[PDB]
């Protein structure tokens, strides 16, 4: 019921009120330097989920949409586990991940000092890199020596808090064989998909799970044949008692990215070019996509994950730009920021109003370029896959006469034709209305002279957007896989060098980059403000009761079940249940669409142990707990730090939570855990993944 | 929370019940047949509407949807009483409406025997008179007397009730003369228009005001500049201490059709047919029509009234489907049917089984000539306005008398078409082609008008066919019409292919009615038999007939409801609701700077809630249907408390069967009625003349 985003280290500032919150935890068995705590059963999945290690072979929770990039690289027509689920029934069964990781906190050390020494000590810094995590997790090398550039299963990542008021350091152990053990069928992990995403009340299934393999001796590995399951530290006990209204909850996860310290000028810009621009662009891109993937199953799996992606960010957008607007948020901003210009005053403190003075000017300087940029990865870079396209290299140049060098080209071309003509693209989607719906708004949106440079030349010899890309496709050689290899028989260097998607392709990356170059004399005066005042911020505040933005480190949050009231007349409870599915069901309608296994179980009512005390079959709830996009797949515990639930989304209201936590309005909604375990169980009939969570469900203990 | 749309002589069998629920009224305080009382303040207003008598200077207050059709009518770009609202400070100042009629109940008398003994030697009878409002009607000189039955001020309506069984009698004053006093700018009247229409929660001012007139003598009258305001014996008392979860409500009013007598067959077909049909067809006719009143404000407001009527239609039928199917309502009327079939069968009563049988058979056999007279109603009859185009020809074209009555004729036969309110611009383009494309692609066009036959066959479309109509005809434009107008020719006069439209059209609808006799004439006859059991079955004082647009009353209490999983829905919505609705760019969601700047300052006086919060609307149990938009609702002790406009979403399946736990009237709170007139409008004479109670 009060907001942030808190550091593991955080915790015993915390630990106090969580108690008289109903907490039944100390501070060390949630986060222990010394030894073992519930931080090491909290993963990072993917990159930019949360998992939870459920059991002593590694088993692991997370949301189907988590699972969501995976499951679709396993699909196809003939097993389509997007459609259909997947459930392995022995560990030989668990499919395979080439390339997913998952990453465990081994260490969390404060490297402020030594970061700044190092950030000074450069000559003629680029405008600011004091905020980039490339740029900053290539200095762990010289914070730690070898054992950094050495040791295979660790990696060392350091980033920015506060603005750059502090760097914190996170030593990580790197999982590289994830294996997919089940997932529900997606009119389950993703029921009312667009429609009920970033909706309360939900009824959503969603989760995956997977499972950590190691090598002979209990070490994080690549993938091979002879790796065991994975044994952890520790992992997170199932309850499965039940929830109720008041409960307290704990989360602990990767929230990605909040903006708590954005002032008046920065809410603005915000909704207005980067929001605006991607709701346009995206909404676009998907009325074409989504039409193309009900008409045929094949491209359906094809451009699932791409579909699902673009859609989250263009509905987040929406969502932001409403909270703004129906909570008054720039103004709560304008409030806040006009407190620590107060308090900045009588303290005699200049520096505070000269920041929030520089992060408008460079706001405003910005505009043009910043639109420019949004528009071209929006419009281009992100819907445009003929961006992807090869482009010749030292064919041309400083070889093509050369038998060896040549050959080298000719493969570089061959490679990535292969990445850009992967599985997942199809020309048809490409050539048809997709590229050419984008290109003609952008061309409307950019002037010409500030249009890339083949765009532009290419839109004035044509008629249009429309005859550009179909001439693209007339005449290039990536057109097709077939006109590629009957090319490659008889590679001409013209035509290779003159290849008009091969231009398209050039030109935007071009301008991508130009537009990055300019952009930087804005984007750094902006950067050294935010540091000068959220600095203020801190002498205001103390650090040790201030939370830091979210930045894709772990953090935890705590609150209770709760439901809210959205508008005038309305209450929304705390607690989902399957009745709620079967009031949504629509066989006409492609996401509410229940499985008849699923309606059959309802309508016998076969929930077995899995049911309420009411006898209704639970599916979601929600809680007060502040949470963000990388939050996704936390697990959500009680007071005793049993697993609880599976954190997956926020309500329509709480989108604004990235900008200001409101306690009536800001709430995570979450899997749970009975929903779960009854899919497993009633639906799957996977016996065994019940067996290996084992569920705690309050028989008596016998000792 | 029990249902029925009760008779008013039904009083008696209910008032018990009711005062278990809180009334305090007695029952000759709502029904006296020897005396004043609630009955002479509830009023039936432009035939189809409801309204209350609320000062004895004859204010009536109505839904802002039934003075709808007036407030158009008034209007113009200047002077925009639809966009603006309209107020009038003085008598003077109110605006006259020549057609609009409000009558009140003065006597209602049972008039089953004489009626039926009527019904008796009409040598060969068509088998569908025994229904007909107007045949009944025109039977009641022979029961009442040549004398009272001329009487200028009276009107007597004769209707069945019960499937034919029974008949009963209402003596109507009728007022001639009735005045618009005030009415709120639409973003308040029907704020949230189309998508909060059959919704709940609301937050809509749903209001209008007008007075009736009378002569010297204080009796009902024909428009004259020397006409006075009427007094009447009863008017209302208002309420504005507020209201709560729980309380009693009583409603009057006029609900105007329901099917609660409907089989399962019926059922599946009025779903399948009529509302199927009016979806799809006023679904193409409204896109039509709201982009072409958006783009222009004229257009905007000769078609305002059309546009909201046909969306609002539209929008039931969405609904009653919608409860047709998830309710199974087509279940819960065959189990209904079948616990009267088993009631017959141990009573050995032969009678129900052939009726059920005989609905059966004749829903059964009237499928596609039923299936025609709809899309023919829907697509162009009610859509399409060339279906009224225009001695004378033949009897004396050469005769400078009936050759000089003819044509004239023909002008006043199109003035009523090209009036003010119609545009031919919007007909070509998208409106009168869209309806036409889609009514042939569906209709073989052998079924089709024989005009309509004619020309998709000839001209490669229906699209060209109405391109070729407007071309090639006289009355497509009034400069065209004119100027071939000093130059009357005998020929081309007949030949008119927009004359030849509307000839056709007419023509195939009532060989359709003809058509349809023979399967009407026995699906009434069968009804009638049906409910007879049923009234059998039930007791007669203890069975609600169905609705037939005669006075009722309903009751129930104040509550919301719990329309789906996790969500709650309150009884009373708010003026913080309107806020945050509000948006600029949106026009159903508009909100007046004024509306939001008493919002903003909380200058609410003795209107608001308890809470300080500013009541809009709120809901209650009552069984209501169209027809009883302006009902006057009531408290305990008779006093006004709001005025009912809508249903929400769930009480639009009411009108087959009632449901407890979902159907809800939605209800204007007084207050916001007062608190518009008052610190909205700064209206004071119409705030003295109503004279709130706060006690
Ligand atoms: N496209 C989807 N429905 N994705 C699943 C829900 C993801 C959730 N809105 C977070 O972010
Ligand atoms: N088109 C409208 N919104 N009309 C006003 C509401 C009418 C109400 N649904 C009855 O019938
Ligand atoms: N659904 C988000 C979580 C959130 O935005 O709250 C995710 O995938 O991480
Ligand atoms: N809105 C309707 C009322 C209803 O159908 O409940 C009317 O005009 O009477
Ligand atoms: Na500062």
């Known amino acids: 019921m009060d907001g942030g985003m808190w550091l593991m280290q955080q915790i015993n500032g915390q630990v106090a009120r969580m108690k008289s919150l109903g907490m039944q935890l100390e501070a060390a068995d949630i986060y222990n330097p010394n030894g073992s705590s519930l931080k090491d059963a909290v993963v990072m999945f993917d990159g930019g989920c949360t998992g939870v290690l459920v059991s002593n072979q590694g088993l692991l929770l997370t949301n189907h949409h988590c699972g969501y990039d995976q499951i679709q690289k396993h699909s196809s027509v003939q097993h389509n586990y997007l459609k259909d689920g997947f459930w392995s029934y022995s560990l030989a069964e668990e499919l395979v991940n080439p390339g997913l990781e998952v990453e465990i ?23 600011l890199e004091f905020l980039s995590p490339r740029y900053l997790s290539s200095l762990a090398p010289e914070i730690v020596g070898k054992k950094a550039a050495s040791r295979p299963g660790y990696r060392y990542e350091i980033k920015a808090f506060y603005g750059g008021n502090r760097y914190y350091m996170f030593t990580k152990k790197v999982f590289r064989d994830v294996r997919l053990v089940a997932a529900p069928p997606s009119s389950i992990g993703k029921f009312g998909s667009d429609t009920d995403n970033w909706a309360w009340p939900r009824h959503t299934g969603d989760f995956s799970i997977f499972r950590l393999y190691a090598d002979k001796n209990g070490n994080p590995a690549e993938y091979s044949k ?68 009900l008409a045929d199953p094949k491209i359906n799996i094809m451009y699932a994950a791409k579909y699902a992606s673009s859609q989250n960010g263009y509905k987040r957008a929406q969502g932001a730009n409403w909270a703004i607007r129906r909570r008054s948020l720039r103004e709560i901003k304008l409030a806040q920021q006009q407190e620590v210009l107060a308090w900045a005053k009588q303290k005699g403190i200049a520096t505070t109003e000269e920041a929030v003075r520089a992060i408008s000017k460079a706001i405003e300087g910005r505009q043009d370029l910043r639109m420019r940029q949004r528009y071209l990865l929006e419009g281009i870079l992100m819907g445009i896959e003929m961006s992807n396209a090869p482009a010749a290299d030292s ?93 490659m028989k008889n590679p001409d260097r013209d035509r290779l060098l003159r290849d008009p998607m091969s231009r398209f392709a050039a030109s ?24 000068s005042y959220v600095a203020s911020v801190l002498d205001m505040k103390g650090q040790p009761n201030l939370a830091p933005d979210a930045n894709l480190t772990l953090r935890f949050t705590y609150g ?24 949504k069901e629509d066989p006409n309608n ?56 599976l954190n997956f989304d926020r309500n329509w209201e709480g989108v604004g939570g990235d900008i200001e936590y409101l306690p009536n309005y800001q709430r995570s909604i979450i899997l749970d855990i009975r929903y779960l375990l009854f899919i497993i169980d009633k639906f799957a009939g996977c016996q065994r993944l019940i067996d290996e969570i084992q569920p705690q469900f309050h028989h008596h203990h016998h000792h």
Request: hydrophobic share 35%; with cysteine; proline share 5%.
């Open 590 to 645: 492609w996401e509410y669409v229940v499985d008849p296994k699923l309606k059959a179980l309802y309508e016998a009512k076969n929930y077995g142990r899995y049911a309420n005390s009411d006898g209704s079959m639970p599916v979601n709830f929600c809680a007060t707990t502040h949470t963000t996009g990388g939050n996704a797949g936390s697990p959500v515990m009680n007071a005793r730090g049993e697993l609880i639930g």
């Open 508 to 531: 935007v990356a071009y301008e991508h980059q130009k537009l990055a170059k300019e952009v930087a004399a804005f984007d750094a005066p902006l950067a050294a403000a935010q540091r």
């Open 226 to 293: 002879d790796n065991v399951p994975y044994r952890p530290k520790r992992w997170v006990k199932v309850n499965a008692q039940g929830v109720k209204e008041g409960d307290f909850a704990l989360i602990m996860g990767y929230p990605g990215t909040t903006y708590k310290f954005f002032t008046a000028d920065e809410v603005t810009e915000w909704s207005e070019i980067d929001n605006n621009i991607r709701i346009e662009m995206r909404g676009i891109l998907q009325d074409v996509m989504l039409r193309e993937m």
């Open 395 to 487: 064919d041309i140049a400083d070889h093509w006469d050369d038998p060896a060098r040549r050959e080298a080209g000719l493969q570089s071309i061959r490679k990535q034709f292969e990445a850009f003509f992967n599985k997942d693209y199809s020309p048809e989607v490409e050539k048809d209305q997709l590229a050419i719906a984008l290109l003609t708004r952008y061309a409307e949106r950019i002037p010409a002279e500030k249009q890339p440079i083949s765009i532009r030349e290419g839109i004035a010899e044509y008629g249009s957007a429309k005859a550009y890309v179909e001439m693209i496709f007339d005449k290039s050689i990536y057109a097709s896989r077939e006109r590629f290899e009957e090319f």
């Open 105 to 127: 906190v081994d260490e969390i050390t404060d490297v402020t000092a030594a970061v700044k020494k190092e950030l000074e000590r450069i000559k003629k810094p680029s405008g």
């Open 560 to 583: 209770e079940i709760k439901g809210y009231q959205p508008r005038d007349v309305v209450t929304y409870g705390a607690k989902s249940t399957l009745e709620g599915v079967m009031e």
